[PDB]
Amino acid sequence: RVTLQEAPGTVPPGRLPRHREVILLADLVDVSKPGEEVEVTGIYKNNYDGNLNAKNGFPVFATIIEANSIKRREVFSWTEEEEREFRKISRDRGIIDKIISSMAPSIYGHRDIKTAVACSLFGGVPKNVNGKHSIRGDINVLLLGDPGTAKSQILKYVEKTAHRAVFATGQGASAVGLTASVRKDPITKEWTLEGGALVLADKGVCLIDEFDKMNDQDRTSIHEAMEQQSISISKAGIVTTLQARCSIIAAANPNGGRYNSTLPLAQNVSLTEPILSRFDILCVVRDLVDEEADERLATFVVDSHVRSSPIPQELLMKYIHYART
Amino acid sequence: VYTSGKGSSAAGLTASVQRDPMTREFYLEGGAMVLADGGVVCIDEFDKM
Amino acid sequence: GDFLGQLITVRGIITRVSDVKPAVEVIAYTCDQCGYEVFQEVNSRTFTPLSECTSEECSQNQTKGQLFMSTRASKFSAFQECKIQELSQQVPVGHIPRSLNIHVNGTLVRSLSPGDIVDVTGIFLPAPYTGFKALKAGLLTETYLEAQFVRQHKKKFASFSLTSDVEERVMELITSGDVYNRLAKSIAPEIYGNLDVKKALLLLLVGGVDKRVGDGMKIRGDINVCLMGDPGVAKSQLLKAICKISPRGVYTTGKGSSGVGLTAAVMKDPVTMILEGGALVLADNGICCIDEFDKMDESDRTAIH
Amino acid sequence: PLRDLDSEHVSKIVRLSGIIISTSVLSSRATYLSIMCRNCRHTTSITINNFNNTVSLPRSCLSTIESESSMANEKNCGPDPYIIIHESSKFIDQQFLKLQEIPELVPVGEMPRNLTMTCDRYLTNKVIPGTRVTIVGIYSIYNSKGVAIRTPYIKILGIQSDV
Amino acid sequence: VDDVTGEKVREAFEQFLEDFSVQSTDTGEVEKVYRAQIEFMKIYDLNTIYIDYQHLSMRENGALAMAISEQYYRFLPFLQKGLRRVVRKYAPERVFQISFFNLPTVHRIRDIRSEKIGSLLSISGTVTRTSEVRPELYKASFTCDMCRAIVDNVEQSFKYTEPTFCPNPSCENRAFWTLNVTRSRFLDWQKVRIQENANEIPTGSMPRTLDVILRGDSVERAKPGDRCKFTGVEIVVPDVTQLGLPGVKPSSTLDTRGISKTSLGVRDLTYKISFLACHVISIGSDEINELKEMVKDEHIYDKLVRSIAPAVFGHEAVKKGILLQMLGGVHKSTVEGIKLRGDINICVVGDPSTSKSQFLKYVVGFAPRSVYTSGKASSAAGLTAAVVRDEEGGDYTIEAGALMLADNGICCIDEFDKMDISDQVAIHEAMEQQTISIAKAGIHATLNARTSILAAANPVGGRYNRKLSLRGNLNMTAPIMSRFDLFFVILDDCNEKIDTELASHIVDLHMKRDEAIEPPFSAEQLRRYIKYARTFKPILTKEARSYLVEKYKELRKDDAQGFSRSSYRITVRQLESMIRLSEAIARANCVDEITPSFIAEAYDLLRQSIIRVDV
Amino acid sequence: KVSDKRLDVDTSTIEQELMQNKVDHNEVEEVRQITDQDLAKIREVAAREDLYSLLARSIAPSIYELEDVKKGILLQLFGGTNKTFTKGGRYRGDINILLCGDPSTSKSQILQYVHKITPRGVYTSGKGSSAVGLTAYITRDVDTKQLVLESGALVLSDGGVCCIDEFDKMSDSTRSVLHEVMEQQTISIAKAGIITTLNARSSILASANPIGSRYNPNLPVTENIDLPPPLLSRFDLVYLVLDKVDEKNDRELAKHLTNLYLEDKPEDDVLPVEFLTMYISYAKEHIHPIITEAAKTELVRAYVGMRKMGDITATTRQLESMIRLAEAHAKMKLKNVVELEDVQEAVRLIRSAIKDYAT
């Protein structure tokens, strides 16, 4: 059985969404995924009765829709013709900029930091030494942001493009909270283990920002996660060690000024030294009145609002899905 | 037991006693020194602690 | 549990006194057809109303009556109960004091203030009750005590009027000579010196004056003596002694009562949503002994003002 | 994987692997027992093997069904008269573990699911919960709480531990 | 007698509508309005009637008007059955609903007694917590396993009593069985619970609630956050929970002194006052030539400035943006990625003791879809939804919530510093996502947010330190500050002409003589002017969109110098705010294809807005 | 339900919904009925020349002081004209006073006497309160076993006088509620029970004590009170009562105070106990004082010189302050109009504070 509610986008003005029950059957099992639309061919019924007794004289019968044809409102791999046309690109030399030229044509400049994002999700090899140690197969990214930048659009492009990309927000906007804990479910009342998003994003890339507004609870978690790639717990009668092979990409916020002083970045930032050490690449954005850049940007804004050579994006996501494995 | 600081993501380090929410029973919740009895304790950042 | 049915003598501390409400004993029933009065005696916790009639004349006849009860003809009884905590002096070295239920009926009601020291004598009877349904081993008897006589230690003032046998000893105190200097020597004499200090505390024991102008304000006839100094004077030797001799004396500390503790509180009532009071609620018309006012809460200072 | 357990897998030999949440407190079933008819003074004995609701005490004193004349010549033990003489009976264990799917892959959109366990005699007191183990099982169904909806369960045969 | 009298009521009412309808001449309608009522209903076939109470008060001189208005519950079938014969006389499945309007007398919840049951009384109030659409049976087909299992029958009333005693099957009176769930005629209904008006509540008393059900046609006419007038009729629902109330409890112990004998299935009753209705109006060409006069002029921009708050005497730019907050943007579509929002947000922090609340009271006092709150005692979930549950068997009924119900309206909230951080994220969800996400102990849900928010906070020390920046004065986080468009710092001085002008203006308000100081427009032709202005939809078709860029560049070239006193990371949103501000200016001008003069006025407007900030 | 003859009588501007009602059904009267013979006796006391001094002395015979301050308590009861416009307006007759100073002043003994007079008096204190502790007392019912919303403290203060002690020791959120009432005279409830604003009018009066137990001189008066001074200046009139080192009234002290205690009986002044009780009630409805042209020349002339002090401040509250105090004095002595005189002592009551502010 599946709950369904009214579409929040096309509400007539002032009114409220309501619910209805939908019952699945044999070949109709598990077509959807929560948070989507659906197009169903429903027959309209109600339940028969439950336990008529002394109540109000008004008969209260809840109505149930059974549906026949579940459809999406108006999954990706390689093929033989897709693995031989694959080799037509990979033989070339100038594929380096062309990847960056197909990354994000919205944000105009900033060639280095677009290249670093292109390198980070593209993956590494851990190459575990036999018996001794594995160093790392992950890329640790720091990006000191600035208000007055489209830095959220970069990580927005990541979650659309990548295979396993989970945006774990800074503070309380998502259901995740980056710390595993034994919780019950109000839908179901039993205790269920709920790992963090870093538990979730193993062999995936997580996107966490506003590090300054993160607690010491979060700060010990990020410290342990980049340390030995494994999270241990000591809850009620349970002691396990779950693994985590994430890759961390940041989006920070400068303290006070947009760029504080001649003082260095560790003096500019309000974070600590060991998380700075475990971060490898450090992307810095700039906010300055540059005469050529403002004419480009403002006319790009108006062109975006009068609306009132790169690889097409299906192929490059087919590229990295096939390559990284 | 490897520990970075006193704090893991959900695991304490010292002898914590948590009451059982069912039956209201006292038991030993956990930590580190009870676990690694007769063994090795690894603690990072003793002064950042 | 072998003293059941005997007549006993216990003592302790009156704690969590309930309210007085009438207990129905027997119910009258007007026939309205045969004209008799039916009577039903109830000794259980709950009961039921009965059938349409149980007369001898409504009986052996086709049309029986249909009855209803009456209020003014029934017999009621004064009912109130409380709990007694252990005396906390004969308790073994590692134990926590228990309690005991005592039912009170009739004339002796409205005679037991909470937080006192009293000798209760009575007879020891069980009540039909067991605990949880699955824990019943088959014959579980829950006991109580019925009150019969009250003898209080620390006899309360403003409750006597007899003077003859009283002045049989009072006049010998009066004719003893130099009485006022003898008094402050007698209250807690177990320290050395501080006679003028004891003399003012003798006057704190008096208080006892009042005046209202009428359609106006009262004046409080209360004395508020503070003590400063440390530490080898042993002030707490007198602080325990004052609330001990004085009736309605509650000994209090600094942190052990918070800003909500010594004032009232609201909890769900047992068998009989009342306002459960604190120590200053308890120790009215009496003297509160207070330790370490310097370490109170700042909100706790506001109540004292 | 635990994600796909269709109705075609009902009561078939299906194995899986996951993470054990937490055990239960050990109760006890009975296998062998001697009874008595509280009127007829009639004693028999009952053994069971597949204890995994199945059987209960009968409702006749059963001395009436007898191939002897003088005993059947000599009333009603009825109703159900049988009281178990507990002093000479035999008992077993029952465990009720609980397992959760491994959260490394695909619980992204949903909440994680779980099932309900039950182990037999020597399988009890075996596994500390939390480890990664594999269990061959029987996907069985019980009834208890109008569309005749029945909750899933696993009859458990042969857990092996991690090395 | 009563079989005759209600039938005499039936026939005289049958006489009434079949007569002439309206006295009026050929100038107007002549005759046969109620006769045209069915004939126009014959065109559309919606199977109800709209009949007047006032025409019924004309003919019988109130003798029949004082016959119906007392016991309407007595008069259900007689009013319906005779009208059914009127239909088949004139017209050809047919099911009816009878609606009234024009009640002369309207009362409140406090003017309702148990003697008023069956009678007609109109009650207005405040609609809160609507519920879903659910059916109602009123047509049982329920008979036993004996042959005649075809009893289309009773329980049309408010009782689940299906089987009649005397059939002529093999079944007896004790024989009863389930209803046939396929052969009946139903109707649907919803269940709203109205709250009492705040303009009628006495001292020491909270507003009161009452349940009401709208059956059949009157479903979906309701609106949470609305004032409405009702059908006069009233019913009573049996209650349960009024036990140990205390009181002498009535019982139903039947007689035993009848049939001679040779147990006790008796019951009690304890009900509650409910309400029922069938007509809900929601109250609460010639001026079009006047609106032509309101648009052909030119000074009306300057006229609309002074015609806002005559009680307030002083500056005017705060009256500009509130007026621009009253005028919507374009909110048009875009490409498939992200749609553009179409709203404006003005957030003012000022000195205590400045009469900023006169602005606050005026906004909620005039504009539609207006919500005022100085919410500190309010929860964070007060502006969010409440998961009310168990009004029935699985109600899950979502409330309105204090934020959403100002849809296309101004919801003004005061004292941001007095509120905590969780609201500020939930505000920032409303200011960025424009939606509301819900996972509250069970049912997950999503909601929306299309409102405009006006703010009123205070400085930390209460006053402005001019050597300090504005950013050291909000005491809140950055993106909720960065989302905000206009700021409007106000601080006052003494000036001996104006100090007398402040003295003259306030005392002349307390002069109840000559308090009729004149704005150039009245309040309601202004409110009419808002409605005509909403249908303009400006498309900028001017080459000066490129001239706007270097105009925006010279807003930044001087901001390229002097980052000392309240510097700003000069934002695309600030340039985007220049768009939406220049929108509603031309909306006041009745001008599409926006001129650069409309740009330049909006250009200097945000210029001196930050000159109020730059110190 | 009707008013006692002893204590005060409620206003008619609040009951007027049920004065519009209750004609349909014969009920109780709810109003202290004025008889006939004492009406000329009211007009007899109204012709007294020394009424402006006799009445304040006759209020509280226990303390022999604060004759301007007791007059404000008297003028608190003759408070203002409830002016509502055709649309909007709603200008009440409230005046709100804080008084402060040294202890041993029997400031509480003043307020208890004030608390007895008020027909809907609410006497609060400090630090036993909360933000929830004044409104929306939503809780569980017992016998019907429901969730019932209760009216709060200011709704219990709706009509009458609220009383607050130790005002300096409130929180930020407590005392933040006071901003809405002192400005708008409303309360905005918007949480899960009710989302609907409501008004609750009262006469707010409170008191506190300074940091030093004695206010020392050579120190600003604005310094030694822990209020934000725009919120401190928001009040209508603020008093300071200090101790003086003189001797002449101190011989008058103990002769007065022993006489209240000596010869255990309540006993050269005429002290009408119950004339003033009906004098205030009769003057409440039959008087709507009008503030016409002749006062406006002097009043605007007076306010600019008050504004002229610059470099505590004087704000637009002080302009509204005088007109609500002047016609309140015109509500005394049966004047439905204003006069150019009686305005000067309305200034002087503010100047009574000001001449105490020299140091």
Residue numbers in the entry:
A (entry chain 2): 387 to 460, 473 to 706, 756 to 772
B (entry chain 5): 437 to 485
C (entry chain 7): 232 to 503, 506 to 538
D (entry chain 5): 147 to 198, 203 to 224, 234 to 304, 320 to 337
E (entry chain 6): 103 to 194, 260 to 429, 442 to 463, 510 to 840
F (entry chain 4): 468 to 734, 739 to 782, 791 to 838
List passages from the publication reporting this PDB structure.
To establish whether DNA maintains its double-helical nature through the MCM dimerization interface, we selected all particles contributing to the ATPase-subtracted MCM–DNA class averages and reverted back to the original images, to reconstruct a full MCM–DNA structure. This approach yielded a resolution of 6.9 Å for the unmodified and 7.5 Å resolution for the phosphorylated MCM structure, showing continuous DNA density that runs through the central pore of the entire MCM double hexamer. The resolution achieved allows for the discrimination of major and minor grooves in the DNA, and for the generation of a model of the MCM-bound DNA double helix. DNA becomes bent by 10° as it enters the dimerization domain and maintains its double helical nature throughout the MCM channel. The observation that each MCM in the double hexamer binds both DNA filaments likely serves as a measure to prevent directional translocation before DNA replication initiation. The resolution obtained for our structures allows us to detect nucleotide occupancy in the six ATPase sites and reveals that Mcm2–5 and Mcm5–3 maintain a tight nucleotide interaction that tolerates extensive washes in nucleotide-free buffer. Conversely, Mcm6–2 is found in an open configuration, which likely favors nucleotide release. Double hexamer formation requires ATP hydrolysis in both Mcm2–5 and Mcm5–3, suggesting that the loaded MCM might be ADP bound.
Replisomes in all cellular systems contain a helicase that unwinds DNA, providing the template for chromosome duplication. In eukaryotes, helicase recruitment at replication origins and DNA melting are temporally separated. To address these questions, we have started to analyze the reconstituted DNA replication system with purified yeast proteins by single-particle cryo-electron microscopy (EM). We report here the structure of the DNA-loaded MCM double hexamer before and after DDK phosphorylation.
